[PDB]
Design a binder for this molecule. Structure first.
Ligand SMILES: Nc1ncnc2c1ncn2[C@@H]1O[C@H](COP(=O)(O)OP(=O)(O)OP(=O)(O)O)[C@@H](O)[C@H]1O
Ligand SMILES: Nc1ncnc2c1ncn2[C@@H]1O[C@H](COP(=O)(O)OP(=O)(O)OP(=O)(O)O)[C@@H](O)[C@H]1O
Ligand SMILES: Nc1ncnc2c1ncn2[C@@H]1O[C@H](COP(=O)(O)OP(=O)(O)OP(=O)(O)O)[C@@H](O)[C@H]1O
Ligand SMILES: Nc1ncnc2c1ncn2[C@@H]1O[C@H](COP(=O)(O)OP(=O)(O)OP(=O)(O)O)[C@@H](O)[C@H]1O
Ligand SMILES: Nc1ncnc2c1ncn2[C@@H]1O[C@H](COP(=O)(O)OP(=O)(O)OP(=O)(O)O)[C@@H](O)[C@H]1O
Lengths: 362, 362, 362, 362, 362
DNA sequence: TTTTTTTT
């Protein structure tokens, strides 16, 4: 009998795998009898144990094929093709709705019975982040809607304040939530053309730590990047399409994606100040620092970095109506979980602890 | 049975598709039983719902093929082959006529039953455009004739004015109208080689915001652009063929397309000035700004960037006689539709509101 | 009859071989009659004499094959696929356990019947290393655990001391034990970006011989290393992912590995100082250089640079329960072997010889 | 009836051919009958006439094949695979053993029954070489052992001497004997890195007359060598692995091979002095040049840069016991020829003619 | 029935054709019936008419095959393979002897019944060129032998003089006579580094206007000749071999070919001067110009550029015994046919017309 | 494999 290339393509679709070697390696594991597969028995990896029993029969025949890499390439192409279609057709709401479904699937596993994570420790993260800025949950919801509508000029946000004020911590969580890339515009003017190539097909971008100049009078080290951004007007305004370049590839034309800019207290030209919708000032606070000392599991597990943390904040704080209609059904079930898991006094007491600078838990 | 490679080629032809991945993805959509196809039922994409029912049977057999990417490669080459045949055998007038027929097809959707656009909003955009320069519609018509005739050493128009005077706005609409590419000349002398490669087989090009030198007397930056263009004379002149380059690919040879140059008020070599046919000055105007502040749905929907808007302006203003004979029938039909939906007084009222800096739609 | 590709795939897996030529060459050796095979009789290479008999028949048929290289390419892909899967799914603690099993296999060879090394000479190396810093074994155990947990901010160790004070030596041994790469960051600021591409998918890095500035007052030749690091805080803190560049390749995004920093006695910014978990001071000591000078077989055999010496040290000093569960069996066997091969007085004397600076062995 | 691919593969192993074109060209010769093959009859080339009569029938069918280069590519892969195996499994002593057998095999034909050379000619070369520097054979034997043992630090000798000292001429013959390369450290230190990858996999290496980087102080043109090697220590001392690079290619790590520094008499830093076991400084000598001027034969056959002469120098002087154990028989089997045919007085006569600068032969 | 690939391969060997497009073009001509072939009847090209009848049958079937370029590729490889076998194995004299046979076979045709040129005009060319410098035939005989023996240092000669010195005229004729290749030395070296790959497998190479600062006294620009060659002294010496570039094929290790350098009478370093074991100075004379002016077929038919003219000159002047041995029957055959047709007095009077600047004919 | 990117 013969290999079903179809069953491989279904697995590649369902795992969303798009490295040929990873696809190859995964599929080969299934050739042993799932009935005794230790990975199955220990429930170690969903992409294995959910699928081993189904694909076992075909994996055995695949193991005898002489065409193995060809089968994988065709499968992987199917996954890549689906992404091209989606990018050229989905609405930005649907894109975001997909991204949330992916995160919610991880949370189902992660706070599942097999899952490692402690929902309490992750809720401690939410209390800390909600403390980082006034009206934090509203600020997130505003940012998200701004990215979805992607209204020209009204597109870009500025994070400003001294080193160790958490701005990159928040940027990373947002970037994890939406998907996107960091970029570094401090380069000399030539290499920028490949930097910007990273933006190709992304949903967000984040500009790291753009060094101004003259602020070294206040110990802020001088750099080029502010002048470069001052010269990247159309990329920021997003009004017309632009051409983007990768190594060994011909240029590609699209609307440059929206995003975030982060900096120390350099002085900003009014030309550039005009382009940001919103400036958010970050400032350091001792009680957060003292709390972190006592609450170190937050850092150890990277909780405060994680888009998973922000999604819990949204689920906790914001009305069911605000979420895209299809996932509202899942959202209700998560609100129901959290309501069972915490009384509001539990949550409030945590926030109080953080404000005291005491360890979050008591 | 076997896959019909012919039917796939037909689908590629009729969608004018020329990405192998997009084609593959699209064709695989059809493999599911047509009758339940939610994309069909919700009438989401004509590129799908027109074709699914027809292609379904062959799509199922295609889904089993071990050879899928080779089948798609042949179809994509057929679409590319037709483009090259046409590029070597059409008149410049015919090319523009075909391009216009395409925009007119897109307009059927925008204002059709699916009707996602509002024709009143898009007609508001035309009012703002007809304010941007004296005799705007006459200027557009003169440029179109210039591009069709393609008279050697009389092929290029110069736009200059302050920043925020409107240059790239108007270039963007002309470029969508005719089809073409933007190019950046502010580069080191090596990178120009691959950069100018982009012009291959295009109808227009636009050289974007060419930087001069000594412009700091006007608080401009300075850069390569002007001294660099002063070398590239024969590309402007278009009297003789030239040899054009792509990455990993051999030099093509053709006449370099006609086009537009944009800049701020750098001072220009009189030699380069003599190579331009026509210079158009742009100036900021307060009432356009105040009108825009009160009319921002123009920006939000990119109306004033869009080639559809320039086509609508021509249909409103120009005699049917000026249109190429084949499309005069469609032009007459669109004129009747516009005359039905708008009085002159309504259009006059809009234009008067713009002159007063009011929101257009009172 | 026909070639079994499966048998070649097994050999490639069992030998963990990932060069197509290395694989091809060795498999061809099996075609000659194993029953006489001088390599087998002289028990020279395990990867041969363990396998020759088993694979013999298939190797003979493979010797006739008309497509040999395609077989070997498929086999090598299978080995590479296993690495990709493991890279993405193992815990760091399992990676180290695997890294240990590999070395224990090679030790079973070195000190086995083939006897190509003397365990007593290697134990001399252990004693000399143990005297290089107080509580050396506890120091090494702490270092390994630190790399295994990879707790953010708590990630980097600093080695200071005069030249020829062993800091390179110990780093080399640790790197041989764990796997990883060195890096040089005394470069100018631009080319650092390609340098840091080295770290992609490594377990450790060593920033080797960072030049400071102004140390040249103590004849420490000055350079940009220190100031480059003081920019790189985000990579060191390890709290969020970063983008790494390779030549002719796209960026790739990951957590930046933990590592070690070595320098002569330059000054440090307090900012940089705060990023280190622990500082270790190296001082040159006369009895060590004199003992080396009278025990030079150590150097000649490159013993003291070798991770095998570190593994022997851990086994000698540290409890079985402290090792990962699976390998505790091999640990027990090796303890028993070493205990039988060395009474304490032997080791005590060897240490005391080092203490006297005389040749270790007298 | 069909081409045996195996017979072609044997011939490739037999010849050790590793160029697909050479293999193809030669094997096609065998299609004519060996019975009148004039190359066979005139005994022109062994790699033909030794094999034609065996391979004849297969070569006829080979000449009718349609796949000819495909057969030959597989055969070249076999020989390259063989090298890859040996290059990784053996140690330096067996490598040298095989290396000597190769040159001994050649001498066993050059002075063989063809008479196509007379060893007498080479003995004049041997005399000139033994006059070149004292105790010459022992200096070679010491260097050979030194480069075999590759003991750390003790890895480099410095040649020194002005133009026409012969230091290049010597290094050439040693590289002929060993295999290895020379390297231009006087390259500018940023580009220099892309040459260092030449050292990959090399048994032995040489540094080309390392220029004082302020060397023109001695009226010797300056170059980066001494600046670089003042710094780049353990590439020479070979204690630990270091990393090396090529243009458009990856880095690779190795122990940097042992070798020879050469210099014209530039200023040398103490760092760079410490690298050397030996710092042999030597002169152009007048009778030597006058000898060659009267002993032109030695240059006419390039003898004084051929390692074949060094092998003969060792064969004459060195005891049989000093050589690799099995080939000691071949050492006897040469000493029989030399010590028969040339008296030590005849040998001393040649050395004396050299010492007098007289034409070596009378 | 089917194409004989063997018969095609014979034609490629017969023609010594080694371009796959040329070969394909050639063979397809034969598909028409040779019996009426105009080219045959016209006796237009020997490469055709000698072969059309023989190959017609096979060409007819070749014309229908669906893989014609595969046949031609294998055939072309057979020709390239033959060259590689000869390249390594032949004596330099034997190579030169083959080259002469080829030229003599053309002279059979040129002065044959085809009679497409007259040895009258060519002998006028001989007479003209025998004026270019004293005893020209004898000077060439030295250059040939210097090249055949290829003795180290004794491998390069320098032509010197003004412009219009004929030095390129002489270089051209020698390169044709040998079948060498050409190179320009005067580049900034890292361009030339890859270009030098051309030198692979060549009997001879030549360098045009080896120049430098030694002519900027006369304000003639410093081409990097004198810059490069004092470094590249080894390549002129030819004492030792080196590795050389190609696209696609592996780098090839060879000695450099011996060759020629030329200059427009710049200075030379004495270090470099030593490599020009001859140097010869050339200066214009007006009567030679007037002769050309009155003998213009000398230039129009390129006679005075052509190696054929040198071969004619050597046949006239040199003794039969001075040639390579086996061709001397052909040497005698042409020496007869020459003096059979020319009295010395006519040849001498031709030379006297040249010396007078009279048109050679009478 | 080159090429474009590296490399400069
Ligand atoms: N608001 C805050 N007040 C005090 N400490 C803070 C605050 N935010 C962050 N921290 C501390 O600073 C550390 C680093 O935070 P983060 O990386 O986000 O700072 P940053 O100022 O945005 O950095 P950078 O500008 O270098 O990207 C945190 O791990 C935490 O210990
Ligand atoms: N003539 C104008 N008067 C007032 N506002 C204008 C005018 N033209 C453009 N604007 C405003 O400025 C924005 C920028 O327009 P655009 O980017 O085309 O102008 P530009 O700065 O002159 O062009 P470019 O970037 O090509 O040099 C417009 O979107 C509109 O909001
Ligand atoms: N503690 C020590 N006391 C004396 N000699 C030492 C000591 N440690 C190392 N050595 C000697 O120094 C040599 C070099 O060691 P190593 O490279 O590890 O030193 P280092 O301090 O890291 O030097 P550098 O920074 O100059 O590379 C060793 O091979 C040994 O000969
Ligand atoms: N000891 C010697 N006595 C006399 N002549 C010598 C001696 N050694 C070399 N020569 C002459 O010098 C020529 C160049 O030799 P070689 O390249 O080996 O010298 P080198 O000292 O390495 O020079 P450089 O520093 O210029 O590279 C030889 O071909 C030979 O003619
Ligand atoms: N001996 C000569 N007397 C007079 N004119 C000569 C002589 N030799 C050559 N010429 C003239 O010089 C012209 C060019 O010759 P050639 O190219 O060989 O010169 P060249 O010195 O090598 O030149 P360049 O340095 O420019 O390449 C010839 O066509 C001829 O007209």
């Amino acid at each position: 009998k013969q290999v079903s290339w179809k069953l491989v393509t279904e697995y590649a679709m369902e795992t969303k795998c798009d490295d040929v070697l990873l696809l190859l390696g995964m599929y080969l594991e299934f050739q042993y009898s799932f009935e005794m597969c230790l990975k199955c028995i220990k429930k170690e990896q969903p992409s294995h144990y959910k699928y081993h029993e189904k694909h076992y029969a075909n994996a055995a025949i695949f193991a005898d094929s002489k065409n193995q890499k060809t089968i994988c390439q065709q499968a992987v192409d199917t996954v890549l093709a689906k992404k091209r279609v989606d990018s050229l057709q989905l609405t930005r709401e649907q894109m975001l709705t997909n991204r949330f479904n992916d995160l919610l699937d991880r949370m189902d596993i992660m706070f599942g019975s097999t899952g490692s994570a402690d929902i309490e420790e992750w809720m401690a993260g939410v209390a800390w982040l909600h403390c980082l800025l006034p009206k934090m949950d509203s600020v997130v919801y505003d940012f998200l809607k701004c990215m979805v509508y992607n209204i020209p000029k009204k597109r870009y946000w500025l994070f400003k304040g001294p080193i160790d004020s958490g701005k990159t911590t928040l940027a990373a969580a947002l970037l994890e939530l939406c998907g996107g890339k960091a970029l570094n515009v401090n380069l000399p003017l030539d290499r920028l053309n490949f930097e910007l190539g990273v933006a190709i097909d992304q949903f967000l971008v984040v500009f790291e730590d753009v060094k101004g100049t003259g602020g070294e009078s206040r110990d802020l080290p001088s750099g080029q990047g502010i002048n470069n951004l001052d010269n990247l007007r159309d990329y920021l305004d997003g009004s017309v399409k632009v051409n983007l370049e990768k190594k060994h590839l011909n240029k590609r034309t699209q609307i440059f994606p929206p995003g975030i800019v982060t900096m120390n207290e350099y002085s900003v030209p009014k030309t550039l100040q005009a382009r940001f919708v919103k400036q958010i000032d970050f400032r350091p606070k001792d009680y957060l620092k003292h709390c972190l000392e006592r609450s170190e599991f937050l850092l150890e597990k990277r909780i405060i970095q994680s888009g998973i943390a922000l999604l819990l904040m949204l689920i906790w704080y914001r009305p069911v109506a605000e979420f895209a209609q299809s996932i509202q059904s899942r959202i209700v079930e998560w609100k129901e979980r959290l309501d069972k898991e915490f009384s509001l006094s539990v949550y409030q007491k945590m926030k109080f602890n953080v404000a005291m600078g005491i360890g979050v838990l008591d």
